[PDB]
Amino acid sequence: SPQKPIVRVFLPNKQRTVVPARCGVTVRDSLKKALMMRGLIPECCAVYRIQDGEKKPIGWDTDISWLTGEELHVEVLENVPL
Numbered sequence: 845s846p847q848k849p850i851v852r853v854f855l856p857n858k859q860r861t862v863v864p865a866r867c868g869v870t871v872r873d874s875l876k877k878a879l880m881m882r883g884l885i886p887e888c889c890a891v892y893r894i895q896d897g898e899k900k901p902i903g904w905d906t907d908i909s910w911l912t913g914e915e916l917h918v919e920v921l922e923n924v925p926l
């Protein structure tokens with residue numbers, strides 16, 4: 845059934861957006877909107893999601909429709925954060 849699923853991304857500065865689980869869409873497209881909805885840009889950010897007290901670094905080329913229902917984190921790449 846054509847349901848509208850969503851995945852919420854925590855933007856930089858501890859904000860949070862929500863994007864539909866865009867099928868055939870990479871993180872970059874979906875969450876570049878996410879940045880722009882805060883007024884930010886996808887250039888200076890990285891995308892990785894916090895799991896069990898840990899971090900699972902996602903790829904900007906990752907298909908976002910697999911990350912549905914799961915909240916992501918976008919963290920500013922300042923001086924290459926590990």
Ligand SMILES: COc1cc(OC)c(/C=C/S(=O)(=O)Cc2ccc(OC)c(NCC(=O)O)c2)c(OC)c1
Nearest residue numbers: 848849850855859860861862863864877878881882
């Ligand atoms: C900060 O930048 C953004 C922040 C947003 O939010 C904080 C939204 C979007 C909010 S939203 O409410 O439209 C998400 C959304 C979509 C579909 C849903 O069901 C199908 C539901 N269901 C739960 C509910 O209705 O609350 C929620 C944003 O969108 C581009 C950008």
